[PDB]
Amino acid sequence: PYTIELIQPEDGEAVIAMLKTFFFKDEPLNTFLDLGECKELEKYSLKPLPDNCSYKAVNKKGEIIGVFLNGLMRRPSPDDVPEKAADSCEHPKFKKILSLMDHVEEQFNIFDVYPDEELILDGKILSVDTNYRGLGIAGRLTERAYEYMRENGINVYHVLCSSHYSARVMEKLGFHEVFRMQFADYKPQGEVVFKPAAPHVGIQVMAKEV
Numbered sequence: 001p002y003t004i005e006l007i008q009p010e011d012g013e014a015v016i017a018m019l020k021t022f023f024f025k026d027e028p029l030n031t032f033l034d035l036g037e038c039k040e041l042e043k044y045s046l047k048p049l050p051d052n053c054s055y056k057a058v059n060k061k062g063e064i065i066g067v068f069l070n071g072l073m074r075r076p077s078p079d080d081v082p083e084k085a086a087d088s089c090e091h092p093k094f095k096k097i098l099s100l101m102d103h104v105e106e107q108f109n110i111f112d113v114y115p116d117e118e119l120i121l122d123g124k125i126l127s128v129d130t131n132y133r134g135l136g137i138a139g140r141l142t143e144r145a146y147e148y149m150r151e152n153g154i155n156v157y158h159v160l161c162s163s164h165y166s167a168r169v170m171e172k173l174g175f176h177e178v179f180r181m182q183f184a185d186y187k188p189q190g191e192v193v194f195k196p197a198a199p200h201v202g203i204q205v206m207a208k209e210v
C-alpha cells in the first residue's frame, strides 16, 4: 500500500536521501562512472521542486519509495543565448553526464517537434526503491503528472531516458521515442566515453502527447 503525493519544499532532504540510496548508485550512467558523492547532482535534483509538479511514492510507514521529479520547460526565446550545463560543473564524473545531455540538446530540440507548444513537462529524475520495483510505481508516478498537465493545458511530457531498459518502461506507459543515440556513437572528442553493458544501448528521448 502506497500513496502518490506532491513533493513539498520541506521534503528536499528526504528526497535527496532516497536518491543517494538508489538513483546515485543505480542509474546506469551513475553506476558506470561510480559517481560517488555528488553535490552537483543533489543541486540538479532539487532544482525542479519549486515548479510544484514533482511526485513521491510513499509507503504505509511514511517512507519515500519512489520519486519522479519534473520541471516545466519553455521554448527558447527568439533571442535565446544557449548555455552548456557542463560548463558550470566542477565534479568530473557528473560533468561527463551533463556533457552528454548538452550534446543531446545540440543534436535535438524537443521544441522543433512541437512548434505550437510553448511549455512542455520535463521528467528529470525517476527512481524507485529496489524492494518496490516491478509493481507499476513508475507508471503511477508518471500518471500523476497527467493530472498536472490537464490542470495546466500542457500537452507534451518529455523524458530523457539513460538506457533502453528505462525507455521500454516509458513505452509501456504510452511514450514513444523522439531521438536516440547509441553510447558507441557518442564520441565528443573522438573516443567513446560511456561503455555500459550492451543491453543499455544508448539514450532515448521519449515523449507522450496527453
Ligand SMILES: CC(C)(COP(=O)(O)OP(=O)(O)OC[C@H]1O[C@@H](n2cnc3c(N)ncnc32)[C@H](O)[C@@H]1OP(=O)(O)O)[C@@H](O)C(=O)NCCC(=O)NCCS
Pocket: 023, 026, 027, 028, 126, 127, 128, 129, 130, 132, 133, 134, 135, 136, 137, 138, 139, 160, 161, 162, 163, 166, 169, 172
Ligand atoms: C526505471 C525504474 C524507475 C522503473 O521503476 P518500476 O516502478 O520498477 O517500474 P515497473 O514496475 O514498470 O517495472 C519495470 C520493469 O522492471 C522489471 N522488473 C520486474 N520486477 C523487478 C524487480 N523486482 N526489480 C527490478 N526490475 C523488475 C520488469 O521488466 C518490469 O517491466 P514489466 O512489469 O512491464 O514486466 C527503476 O528500475 C529504477 O529506479 N531504475 C534505476 C534508476 C533509473 O535508471 N531511472 C530512470 C532513468 S531514465
Ligand SMILES: CC(=O)NCCc1ccccc1
Pocket: 027, 029, 030, 041, 097, 123, 124, 125, 126, 127, 159, 160, 161, 162
Ligand atoms: C528521467 C530520468 O531519471 N533521467 C535520468 C537522466 C540522468 C540524470 C542525472 C544523472 C544520470 C542520469
Ligand SMILES: CC(=O)NCCc1ccccc1
Pocket: 163, 164, 177, 180, 181, 182, 183, 200, 201, 202, 203, 204
Ligand atoms: C529505433 C530503435 O530501435 N531504438 C531502440 C534501440 C536504441 C538505439 C539507440 C539508443 C538506444 C536504444
